[PDB]
């Protein structure tokens, strides 16, 4: 299962924190800090599947964002990496360009996209065209 | 569109040090508090703007303890956006209250009594994104009523499946198993594809909990998988991820099949074997796109298939093809593929059907261990090398492990030395090599070896009774090294005190020089090492009667009799009294037997498991 | 033209410093290194050193460039080139650079001479097995005899480093009156030169006492400003030259009274050098006690010192505790006991215990202070007080046995192995004094495993002692603990001693009574003294890390 | 003797490295990092014996200094040398900070090369070290006619910039440059010396009266303003460019009969200010016969004279959304047309400087007349014109 999804930046600010299990108050901040410390050190010539504690994260760089899904030990590795890429591409075709400014100014749209394609810790939807169609059909309706 | 958020976040972003940000955020909090209290704030849009601003205030990193009743009031509305913002706020901020939780439950219950997929989906997302005992109690029998074969749209079906998954994950005892299993199982054969994904996730979790309930789903999963892997070039184009048909769904179906024993029906097993063969053959085909994502999809499906084959452990030809594919991947240009192939082959090596095929790739595994000089890839190579170790191949593996231990960073030094010790102990043909390997570990790592490696080596030397001479010798010519670790000092003290007679024949190994070097190493050691050396001394008292005078002159001095440690003082006084009484009818009896050590529980494996 | 090349070189250097590999521009930088500007030449040399630090095999083609730079009229550029080329790790680079190294021996520049000395030291490691190494060493020794402080200091340091090899030649240097010449050079040298020359001269063995007296007189005012380094080296050489007989002229007391003030005042720098100075003064006090006789107030640690400084100051005050200063040290320890730090409180109470052991008259005062500290009811304080009480009991037998119950009253919870060992030893030895011994051993025989070996062995020996004292109430108990020790514990030491006791009790109980329950001798004020031979050898290495680690150099290298 | 020197940050990254002795390797680096950076409960001590290798460490704010040795080194000498190096760094570029270390990498390498060689800490005197070190660190903490009288002391500061941009359709920027010119009007009396402070944000023709003596402190420019309007300064910056508009053309060749092109414009500036005269020219294939468009903002018409689609916007705020969908009918033709794929051209002006230049302070001091600086009416407004704003399609 997916433990949490993060969309960090180069500095360390969390542009999207989405936890799928109950963590403590300071535990969330400690996890974010240590995930940032682990991810930032590595570079392109490294595996994206870095493990820590009892879990493993799936970090993928995109411009100035570090998308990270933390999965269980037994969960597959490449599938969630491609789920990250699919999520990034849905954002890219939704905002017409993905950037920190759009995430900051439209945080609730990011939350509804995440809950559209990542629900209860598993992969709710795996397609781009159908998600975009269902989101546009649920955007003109107000 | 919303106008207040744009200006508010624009103002709060380009701010000075935390003082100005705190001032601005507190001013906005005061303004919103004044707006919430009284006034004509009955308009829904104003409540929306205030709730969104407050949510951003919370997510910025500041604590929020108000504006909750006026926010849950947004749920009772007909505008979609108000409901969405209210649900998002409830999901983000969670508090334990009696009236508030009851009001939220009433609002959600009213929401579920609708006829549009949007409201039902929003309510389901609100239920599943937080999870609570009250929600499960008030909706244990409502989610299956959605998932049952009623007139519901596909999106709400997927949402309900995942919500039931979450509720079972958080409230296992509140989920019944009524007459809806026969509907969820047949739901996996339903049209559409995301619905199959959600149903497969739910069924996988439930079968991992109660396997016997969903035995019917295996055949349906096999049929769906065999139809997906080989369907057409562009059939169901909504789900072809870079010319690979539904990688995530195939991974989910293989995960579901993994949690079950091999299918009983010969036809189902035949279709499964044909599907796996097709997956392997398509993985051997050249890519249809030069992009890396197509290769990622193909390799993800392939590794899931390989994991399924390993778990089943029933097809020998399939396992051989799996080993060949992993060997081909071991030299892949990609970095993720190498690490994942190492992990998969480490899993596969336990299967006896292809142990020789796994062992065949030892040259590539060793070259990987020595070449890319990574931190995770090399650790996986270490684990894989530990996996294939056998009696005929122990020598090369242990030598390469030691060579890696020479230049390995010290964070992983303990696991490697424990692995080397257990491998030498378990796969030794002649125990002289085992003693040599243990002494090499002591010399090379020393500081990071273990608590219980030298325990095991002393136990082995005492029990086997055939390698005692060589062990005592190599210990003697290892002690006289200029710098030696104190673990070697303890081992040498015990081994000499037990087998000084076997090497006493050599004039160069006279008891006098042994005692002199032991006393020289005695001055600089910790207290337990000095206790071990005192026990060795009392063994030498009777084992060598000629060195009795020198020993007595050693431990009768004020260094040991007047020591400030209870252990050393007690040992010294007891040993001195035993030497002084000089009866010799009791000393030779007490200090000569030391019967062999039975294998208690193999503590090295226990410690290795507890560390990982 | 040249400005563009300089800008490109600077950009390449910046890119290399960032982390990216710039080996693609390495041939271009090598080609452009042939210039005349000092800044450009220095930048090129630095870039070449950075690039060849890990890949010197591909830099063998720079031999021509090094030879050309060695012919430059500027001595600084030649020295830079020689220093850069001396660190090349190749089997034929040393052979090719030997001739430039031989020619650089006679140079009219202190910087060139220092670089030549460093190059000789570097070449000592690689390709030094024939008479060429001896010739280079002789040339360096000849170059040492110069008025320039830099050349003599660097030559002495290089020779000392090369003295690691032991071909039956004790540094293969020095001479009669050469010690005086080196002292004059140090007087004419800088701080680091003084450190190097003192380190070199600390291994000299004077033939007679006249040379030692002259050295002591010369190095008497050598209390420089280099903080611990030069002062400690001078102190080491002074005590190494302190070979005059006690029944001689009054120079022993004069030397001690001259050495004491700089050593006392050395404890005024940063905490890091304070740590080294504290360990060194610990060794000096343990060897020579009549130096810090009346400076106990100096070692009163303030509130701005770190934990290690505090602990070592506590140890040195224990070493300097005497009858006259009992009140001051006890008050200081009482104040220190409330310093929040757990390890520091442990050290303070251990200091109280060791001071009680050291001084027989102040035992009552120490016991009273410990009892007052019990009123704090702090758990670790109580546990350490139990340990201290066990330590005291071995010194004074059957004298303070009535105060054990006062500490045991509020010690219901024990969380540290030392406290458990202390309680078990007190119960085992004083089995008749406390009748709850059976219950205490029954309670302790629950976590026999998953405990430190100290606790296990102390419990075993105390159980055997109690059985030898009260056989009627404890068999059916000793059998269980012995079975657990020799059938469930895998420790060869523990199992071996278990069989020792098993075969002793089952052979002759009278022998066991005469052996195990023998009247143990007194602790004799054991204050963690070092063996005289090891201490004497460590005095010969006061300056180096041997004093900080309290180990001879043979134990780590 | 001394086997090297290292400097660590709070994250455990090796900022610099120097390995003089052969024995010390990356193993020592990892050992020190694990044993001090990831310390959990070890008792503090400056020197630790791990793998027979000593490790002297000294703390300076968020910077860790490490001296690695594998010999019987004089313990106090290493600490004294570390203190001397700290004093040298303090004298060179003040307090040790992350920015100072990052900006002075070459200086640090030169200093370590000069002060220390093969492990012998040579003389570190300031006079001796100045000669052998040539690198300098980075520190981070028009005549006027006499007797001219004006009724009111007012002046204007008009900052005009021209922005140019060329983006690939994927959104990757290749190269951009902004050509800016500052023209100010000074309708003030007297001949005062005025201080004009602004954020530099760039490292450098200049005017006759402009003197850059104090250019190291932000701007710190001083000049006597001549009567009338004149060009205060001309420059061109390429480092920090804030693009006011982003255009993402989503072309789609739906067969040869027709052609559908969707174009979106995304503003990425503060919505507290409004851009005006937004003009976008959408190219069309030469075989165009009839185009119908749907515009959310403004209006668009087809211009067959120039063979392009012009899109006109009255005004829009920041962080706004706009979408235009054009269906372009295509003539049958034979081949080789391809529409030549010309770039997307846009015209706009924004009330802020794209280069990021901002006026910090502007004080006018007159010793003779002795009028208050606050009494001088000052008006500053920014108009950022758009040059060639081309996006490939």
């Amino acid at each position: 299962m997916i433990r949490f999804i993060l969309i960090q930046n180069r500095a360390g600010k969390t542009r999207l924190a989405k936890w799928y299990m109950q963590f403590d108050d300071d535990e969330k901040q400690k996890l974010i800090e240590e995930v940032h410390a682990v991810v930032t050190v590595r570079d392109a010539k490294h595996t994206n599947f870095v493990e820590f504690r009892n879990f493993k994260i799936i970090y993928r760089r995109y411009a100035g964002l570090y998308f990270c899904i933390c999965v269980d030990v037994n969960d597959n590795n490449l599938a969630y990496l491609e789920a990250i890429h699919n999520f990034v591409e849905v954002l890219n075709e939704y905002f017409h360009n993905v950037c920190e400014l759009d995430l900051v100014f439209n945080f609730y749209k990011v939350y509804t996209v995440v809950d559209e394609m990542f629900l209860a810790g598993e992969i709710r939807e795996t397609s781009q065209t159908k998600v975009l169609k269902q989101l546009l059909m649920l955007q003109s309706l107000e | 569109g919303m106008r207040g958020l744009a200006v508010f976040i624009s103002d709060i972003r380009n701010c000075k040090s935390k003082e100005a940000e705190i001032k601005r955020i507190n001013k906005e909090l005061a303004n919103i508090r004044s707006k919430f209290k009284g006034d004509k704030a009955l308009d829904g849009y104003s409540k929306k703007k205030y709730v969104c601003k407050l949510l951003f205030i919370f997510l910025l990193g500041h604590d929020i303890d108000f504006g909750h009743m006026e926010a849950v009031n947004l749920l009772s509305s007909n505008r979609y956006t108000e409901k969405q913002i209210g649900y998002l706020f409830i999901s983000v901020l969670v508090n334990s209250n009696s009236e508030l939780i009851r009001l939220i439950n009433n609002a959600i219950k009213n929401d579920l009594a609708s006829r549009n997929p949007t409201f039902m989906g929003l309510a389901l997302h609100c239920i599943a994104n937080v999870g609570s005992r009250e929600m499960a109690e008030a909706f244990a029998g409502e989610i299956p009523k959605i998932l049952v074969a009623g007139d519901t749209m596909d999106s709400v079906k997927q949402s309900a499946a995942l919500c039931l998954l979450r509720l079972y994950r958080t409230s296992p005892d509140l989920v019944p198993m009524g007459d809806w299993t026969s509907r969820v199982v047949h739901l996996l054969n339903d049209q559409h594809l995301g619905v199959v994904t959600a149903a497969t996730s739910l069924i996988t979790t439930l079968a991992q909990k109660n396997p016997e309930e969903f035995k019917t789903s295996v055949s349906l999963a096999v049929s769906r998988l065999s139809r997906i892997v080989t369907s057409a070039s562009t059939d169901l184009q909504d789900y072809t991820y870079y010319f690979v048909p539904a990688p995530w769904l195939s991974v989910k179906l293989l995960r579901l099949l993994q949690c079950y024993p091999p299918p009983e029906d010969p036809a189902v097993r035949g279709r499964l074997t044909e599907c796996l063969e097709t997956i392997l053959n398509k993985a051997q085909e050249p890519p249809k796109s030069k992009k890396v994502q197509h290769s990622n999809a193909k390799n993800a499906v392939l590794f899931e298939a390989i994991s399924l084959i390993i778990h089943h452990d029933s097809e020998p030809n399939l396992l051989v093809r799996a080993c060949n594919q992993l060997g081909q991947f071991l030299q892949h240009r990609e970095t993720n593929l190498r690490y994942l192939a190492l992990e998969s082959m480490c899993t596969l090596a336990s299967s006896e059907f292809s142990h020789e095929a796994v062992k065949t790739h030892i040259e590539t595994v060793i070259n990987a261990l020595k070449t890319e000089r990574d931190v995770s890839v090399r650790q996986r190579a270490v684990d894989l090398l530990y996996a294939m170790c056998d009696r005929s191949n122990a020598q090369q593996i242990v030598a390469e492990m030691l060579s890696y231990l020479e230049t390995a960073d010290y964070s992983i030094r303990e696991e490697i030395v424990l692995k080397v010790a257990i491998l030498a102990e378990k796969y030794a043909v002649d125990y002289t090599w085992y003693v040599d390997t243990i002494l090499n570990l002591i010399r090379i790592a020393g500081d990071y070896v273990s608590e219980e490696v030298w325990y095991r080596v002393i136990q082995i030397v005492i029990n086997r009774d055939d390698v005692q001479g060589y062990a005592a010798k190599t210990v003697f010519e290892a002690l006289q090294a200029p710098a030696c670790h104190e673990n070697l000092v303890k081992v040498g003290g015990y081994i000499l005190g037990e087998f000084g007679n076997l090497i006493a024949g050599d004039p160069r190994s006279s008891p006098l020089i042994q005692f002199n070097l032991l006393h020289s190493k005695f001055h600089l050691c910790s207290v337990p090492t000095r206790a071990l050396l005192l026990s060795t001394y009392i063994k030498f008292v009777n084992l060598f009667p000629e060195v009795k005078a020198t020993i007595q002159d050693v431990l009768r001095s004020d260094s040991q009799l007047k020591n400030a440690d209870v252990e050393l003082q007690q040992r010294a006084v007891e040993y001195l009294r035993l030497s002084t009484v000089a009866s010799t009818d009791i000393l030779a009896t007490v200090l000569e037997e030391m019967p062999p050590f039975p294998e208690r529980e193999s503590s090295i494996l226990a410690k290795l498991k507890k560390k990982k | 033209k040249k400005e563009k090349r300089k800008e490109a070189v600077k950009k390449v250097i910046a890119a290399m410093t960032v982390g990216k590999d710039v080996s693609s521009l390495f041939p271009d930088v090598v080609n452009c290194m042939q210039t005349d500007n000092l800044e450009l030449k220095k930048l090129v040399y630095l870039y070449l050193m950075n690039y060849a630090k890990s890949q010197p095999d591909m830099a063998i083609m720079a031999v021509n460039s090094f030879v050309k730079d060695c012919e430059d009229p500027n001595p600084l550029i030649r020295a830079l080139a020689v220093r850069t080329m001396g660190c090349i790790r190749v089997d034929k680079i040393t052979e090719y650079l030997c001739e430039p190294l031989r020619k650089c021996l006679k140079d009219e520049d202190p910087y060139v001479r220092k670089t030549a000395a460093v190059c000789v030291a570097k070449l000592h490691d690689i390709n030094a097995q024939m008479v060429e190494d001896q010739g280079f060493l002789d040339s360096l020794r000849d170059l040492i005899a110069d008025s320039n402080p830099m050349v003599v200091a660097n030559a002495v340091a290089a020779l000392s480093e090369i003295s690691e090899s032991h071909p039956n030649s004790n540094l293969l240097d020095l001479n009669p009156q050469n010690i005086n010449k080196l002292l004059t050079a140090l007087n004419e040298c800088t701080e680091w030169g003084q450190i190097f020359i003192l380190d070199c001269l600390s291994n000299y063995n004077p033939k007679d006492d006249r040379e030692a007296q002259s050295i002591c007189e010369r190095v008497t005012p050598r209390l420089s400003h280099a903080n611990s380094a030069v002062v400690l080296s001078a102190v080491k050489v002074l005590m190494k030259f302190l070979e005059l007989l006690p029944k001689d002229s009054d120079y022993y007391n004069m030397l001690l009274k001259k050495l004491a003030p700089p050593l006392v005042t050395l404890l005024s720098g940063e905490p890091e050098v304070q740590y080294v100075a504290l360990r060194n003064i610990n060794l000096i006090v343990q060897k020579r006690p009549e130096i810090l006789k009346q400076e106990i107030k100096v070692f009163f640690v303030k509130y701005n010192d770190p934990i290690y400084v505090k602990l070592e100051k506590l140890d040195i005050m224990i070493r300097l505790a005497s009858q006259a200063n009992i009140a001051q040290v006890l008050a200081e320890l009482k104040e220190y006991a409330t310093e929040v730090d757990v390890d520091f409180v442990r050290k303070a109470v251990r200091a109280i215990g060791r001071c009680a052991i050291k001084v027989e008259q102040s035992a009552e005062r120490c016991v009273s202070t410990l009892l007052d500290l019990i009123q704090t009811k702090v758990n670790y304080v109580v546990q350490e007080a139990i340990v201290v009480i066990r330590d005291i009991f071995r010194k004074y037998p059957n004298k303070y046995e009535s105060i054990i119950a006062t500490l045991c009253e509020n010690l219901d919870s024990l969380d540290e192995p030392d406290a458990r060992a202390a309680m078990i030893w007190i119960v085992g030895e004083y089995a008749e004094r406390i009748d709850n011994a059976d219950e205490l051993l029954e309670s302790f025989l629950e976590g026999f495993h998953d405990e430190s070996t100290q606790v296990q062995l102390t419990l075993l020996t105390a159980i055997v002692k109690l059985f030898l004292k009260k056989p009627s109430e404890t068999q059916e108990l000793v059998q269980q603990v012995l079975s657990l020790a020799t059938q469930d514990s895998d420790n060869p030491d523990l199992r071996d001693r278990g069989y020792i006791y098993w075969r002793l009790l089952s052979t002759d109980p009278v022998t066991a009574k005469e052996v195990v329950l023998s009247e143990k001798p007194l602790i004799s004020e054991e204050t963690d003294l070092i063996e005289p031979t090891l201490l004497d050898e460590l005095i010969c290495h006061i300056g180096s890390l041997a004093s900080v680690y309290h180990k001879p150099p043979n134990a780590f290298v | 003797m001394i086997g090297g020197l290292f400097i660590y940050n709070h994250k455990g990254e090796v900022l610099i490295s120097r390995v003089y002795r052969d024995d010390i390797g990356r193993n020592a680096v990892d050992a020190f990092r694990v044993n001090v950076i990831h310390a959990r409960q070890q008792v503090r001590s400056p020197v630790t014996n791990i793998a027979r290798t000593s490790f002297f460490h000294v703390k300076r704010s968020n910077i860790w200094l490490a001296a690695v040795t594998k010999q019987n080194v004089n313990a106090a000498m290493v600490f004294e040398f570390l203190y001397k190096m700290c004093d040298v760094m303090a004298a060179y570029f003040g307090k040790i900070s992350e920015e100072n270390i990052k900006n002075n990498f070459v200086l640090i390498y030169e200093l370590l090369d000069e002060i220390l060689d093969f492990g012998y800490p040579q003389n570190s005197e300031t006079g001796a070290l100045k000669t052998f070190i040539t690198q300098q660190g980075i520190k981070s903490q028009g005549w006027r006619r006499e007797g001219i009288k004006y009724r009111r002391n007012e002046l204007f500061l008009d900052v005009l910039e021209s922005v140019n941009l060329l983006m690939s359709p994927q959104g990757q920027v290749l190269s951009a440059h902004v050509s800016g010119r500052v023209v100010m009007k000074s309708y003030l009396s007297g001949m005062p010396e005025c201080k004009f402070g602004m954020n530099d944000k760039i490292v450098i023709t200049f005017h006759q009266c402009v003197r850059l003596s104090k250019f190291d402190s932000e701007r710190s420019i001083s000049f006597i303003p001549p009567d009338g309007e004149f060009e205060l300064m001309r420059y061109r910056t390429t480092k920090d460019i804030i693009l006011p508009f982003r255009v993402i053309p989503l072309v789609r060749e739906v067969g040869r009969t027709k052609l559908e092109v969707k174009v979106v414009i995304k503003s990425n500036f503060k919505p507290s200010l409004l851009a005006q005269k937004i003009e976008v020219r959408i190219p069309t294939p030469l075989n165009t016969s009839g185009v119908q468009v749907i515009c959310m903002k403004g209006k668009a018409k087809y211009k067959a004279s120039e063979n392009a689609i012009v899109w006109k916007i009255k005004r829009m705020a920041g962080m706004k959304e706009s979408q235009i969908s054009a269906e372009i009918e295509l003539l049958p033709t034979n081949d080789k047309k391809k529409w030549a794929r010309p770039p997307i051209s846009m015209n706009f002006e924004v009330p802020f400087a794209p280069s990021g230049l901002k006026v910090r302070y502007l004080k006018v001091f007159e010793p003779k007349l002795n009028y208050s600086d606050h009494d001088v009416i000052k008006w500053v407004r920014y108009i950022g014109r758009s040059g060639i704003y081309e996006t490939r399609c």
Side-chain angles (χ1 to χ4, degrees), chain C residues 263 267-269 271-281:
Chain C
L263 207 46
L267 198 147
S268 300
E272 272 80 10
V273 294
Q274 276 205 21
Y275 175 64
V276 183
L278 270 168
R279 312 286 302 216
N280 288 252
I281 198 163

Side-chain angles (χ1 to χ4, degrees), chain B residues 124-133 135-141 143-145:
Chain B
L124 293 192
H125 299 173
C126 175
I127 297 169
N129 213 358
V130 58
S132 174
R133 317 277 306 118
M135 312 274 198
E137 277 157 330
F139 296 116
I143 308 294
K145 190 257 288 178

Side-chain angles (χ1 to χ4, degrees), chain D residues 21 24-25 27-29 31-35:
Chain D
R21 295 322 290 285
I24 295 90
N27 305 324
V29 173
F32 180 81
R33 160 200 283 110
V34 170
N35 284 116

Side-chain angles (χ1 to χ4, degrees), chain C residues 145 149 151-155 157-159 167 176-177:
Chain C
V151 65
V152 57
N154 264 207
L159 189 147
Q177 189 273 331

Side-chain angles (χ1 to χ4, degrees), chain C residues 135 145 149 151-155 157-159 167 176-177 185 192-198 206 212 221 226 229-239 246 252 255-256 259-263 267-269 271-289 291-292 296 298-301 306-321 324:
Chain C
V151 65
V152 57
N154 264 207
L159 189 147
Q177 189 273 331
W192 271 260
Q194 289 173 41
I195 296 153
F196 286 133
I197 194 66
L198 292 174
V230 58
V231 174
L232 285 169
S233 292
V235 160
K236 150 186 65 175
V237 70
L238 290 174
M239 293 183 286
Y252 204 111
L255 203 52
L256 295 180
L259 189 141
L263 207 46
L267 198 147
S268 300
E272 272 80 10
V273 294
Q274 276 205 21
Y275 175 64
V276 183
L278 270 168
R279 312 286 302 216
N280 288 252
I281 198 163
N282 190 312
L283 276 179
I284 295 166
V285 164
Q286 283 188 50
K287 166 65 172 209
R288 301 298 300 164
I291 290 165
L292 277 297
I296 190 167
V298 190
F299 302 114
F300 278 14
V301 58
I307 172 168
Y308 42 90
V309 173
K310 287 176 181 174
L311 189 153
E312 182 65 26
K313 277 206 212 164
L314 260 60
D315 273 338
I316 196 50
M317 293 182 286
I318 301 159
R319 295 300 194 284
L320 284 186

Side-chain angles (χ1 to χ4, degrees), chain A residues 43-44 46-50 52 55-60 62-71 76-99 101-108:
Chain A
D43 63 349
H46 264 310
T47 50
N48 300 141
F49 307 105
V50 56
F52 76 93
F55 296 155
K56 62 166 170 281
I57 45 169
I58 310 301
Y59 82 102
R60 183 69 164 159
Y62 274 110
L65 307 178
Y66 291 165
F67 297 77
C68 303
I69 293 176
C70 178
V71 310
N76 202 315
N77 284 254
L78 275 163
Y80 287 114
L81 186 38
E82 265 171 317
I84 283 148
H85 175 90
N86 214 25
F87 169 73
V88 161
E89 278 206 4
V90 161
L91 269 294
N92 189 359
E93 293 179 353
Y94 182 34
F95 296 165
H96 310 96
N97 191 0
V98 63
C99 59
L101 289 169
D102 273 297
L103 306 181
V104 170
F105 279 75
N106 284 260
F107 50 84
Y108 46 99

Side-chain angles (χ1 to χ4, degrees), chain A residues 18 46-49 76 78-79 82-83 85 89 101 105 111 115 119-120 122 124-127 130 138, chain B residues 10 13 59 118 129 155 158-159 162 192 201 238-239 241-242 248 252 293 296-297 304 335-336 374:
Chain A
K18 181 73 180 301
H46 264 310
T47 50
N48 300 141
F49 307 105
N76 202 315
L78 275 163
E82 265 171 317
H85 175 90
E89 278 206 4
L101 289 169
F105 279 75
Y111 270 83
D115 276 334
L119 185 57
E122 291 266 0
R124 208 190 92 89
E125 191 89 58
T126 63
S127 66
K130 169 150 42 60
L138 261 63
Chain B
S10 302
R13 286 264 316 285
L59 269 71
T118 300
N129 213 358
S155 78
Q158 297 185 54
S159 295
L162 281 187
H192 201 199
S201 285
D238 282 310
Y239 274 85
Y241 182 70
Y242 290 2
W248 298 277
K252 292 256 169 293
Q293 272 84 0
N296 263 357
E304 207 55 35
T335 317
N336 316 322
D374 210 328

